[PDB]
């Protein structure tokens, strides 16, 4: 399971800023940052379970997103940059 | 063909800022802005390639990326929020 996370925070205020440097470690263990709040992670169901209630916990709900997509097997041949 | 579209670029600066705004305009011309740098667009495979260009005119090469994922049919299912 490849799931791509992508985290909306307004990064010009410190608060914003350190919720993304605490969600980049969080994700980080679970994969690439290839985007500075954009991540490649490789996690278990119960793993994606368990980030989401940490992610739940540092975002602030009411001004932050984050959105995950389940990429399929294969999603590398999948990807391109610009 | 749906594409993800995501844009890194530094918003602290305007000219980033800017930026943002015309990546913007013109992916929502193709889909829907999801949240403030990310787009969910439906294209052409010639519609992917104008686009392409246009963005590559638009964004600051040395410090911007953008990346595109090419996510299947029913894509929207595959799809989770939080927040």
Redesign the interface.
């Given at each position: 399971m490849m799931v791509?996370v992508?985290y909306?925070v307004?990064?010009?205020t410190p608060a914003g800023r350190k919720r993304l440097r605490h969600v980049a470690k969080l994700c980080v263990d679970y994969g690439q940052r290839?985007?500075?709040?954009?991540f490649e992670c490789s996690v278990t169901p119960a793993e994606f379970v368990d980030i989401?209630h940490r992610?739940?916990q540092i975002?602030d709900?009411k001004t932050?997103?984050?959105?995950?997509?389940?990429?399929?097997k294969n999603?590398q041949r999948?990807?391109?940059?610009?």
């Open positions: 791509l992508t909306d307004n990064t010009e290839v985007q500075n709040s954009v989401k992610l739940t975002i709900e932050d997103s984050i959105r995950f997509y389940l990429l399929g999603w999948r990807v391109e940059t610009l």
